[PDB]
Amino acid sequence: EPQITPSYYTTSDAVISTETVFIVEISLTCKNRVQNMALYADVSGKQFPVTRGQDVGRYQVSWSLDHKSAHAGTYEVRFFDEESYSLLRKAQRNNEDISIIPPLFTVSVDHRGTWNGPWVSTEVLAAAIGLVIYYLAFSAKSHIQA
Amino acid sequence: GARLLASKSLLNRYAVEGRDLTLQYNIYNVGSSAALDVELSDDSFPPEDFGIVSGMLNVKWDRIAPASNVSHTVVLRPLKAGYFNFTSATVTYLAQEDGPVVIGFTSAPGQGGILAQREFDRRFSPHFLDWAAFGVMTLPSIGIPLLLWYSSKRKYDT
């Protein structure tokens, strides 16, 4: 009966940062009072060992992705214990259905995407707008002559 | 015995005042044995100058398998602009069971210049309200002749 209070951080300014970094902080409390237990996190098929802080019951998992690959959306982080992690790895090696193994707990991280700059360009888009008003003039002319 | 190579790197192109600073710690076990009781401590960021947004600077791992790596990241926010020296962190681990504690330092990014928020904005901030104001300012001298020209169209060319 794990009890978790999850906190997560996601890079929002891609102009400054080189890569998009995802950080998940979880304070884990167990009914049986197990402490310093090794956690493993799976994110979209990628497994990362769970880092343990100095404080009791505090765990963090961090990974980085390229700005082009850090698509906006919700990222599901699945946490497994040593036995569940071993079973998951065995299933992965055998090409078995990974979804069969239930994670200890899941944390959903919602990423709103990174900000990169203005798509609109005065050299191309603005030039078309000026042409359009003058093309409206030409259309009006073409209509009346006829 | 286990041999750990720890690298401390910055995942930000530039250091900007008031903006999140991303720190990534990578520990690689190049030894034949797995590192036991690996603890990472980074006391080089005083709270008066850097505010912790996410992550914890002091971490521990029970075991790091040989030929394996562990990645840790911490997000900080500088509180004062100027030059800052990103010193190396301290890594302690047991190379073998019941063996002596090995103390090592991660990679040091060195001295880095934290750009003041005002300077960063002056160098990179987007101008939109001045852009609207500029455009409005130009609007008369360009449009008044334009409206007079349309008056030409519409009085007596039909």
Added chain:
Amino acid sequence: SADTTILFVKGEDFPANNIVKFLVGFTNKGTEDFIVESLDASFRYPQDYQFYIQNFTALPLNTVVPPQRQATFEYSFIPAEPMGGRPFGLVINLNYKDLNGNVFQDAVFNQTVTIIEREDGLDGETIFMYMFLAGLGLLVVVGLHQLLESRKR
């Protein structure tokens, strides 16, 4: 009294025109503070390492390593494209000095390196830039086509 290790994390196969990044670990088993000055990488002739082929920018470190303490350093370089496909001996030197100022140099990596050429196919994004410009001109093309049709009619 100095122990060094090197680990290639990216570009272990040394791809041409690709970033190669390796970690060098310096361990101080002496009783004095070691001062790591710079880390240098250079490509040598496989048949004669004395003749330099390409010298990469030195990475001055100037980091003091206390006794019984370990320090890790990160270095990266990008092999040149024309130079791919040829064996190049790689000499990587870590420079460290005693408190007295005596300087000792250790070659962390001294082995022949195989470099693999990479070829990039035509890019569609350049064609997309070109076609957006060509459409900026194609609006004019359509206008002139209408003018020519009117002239012919």
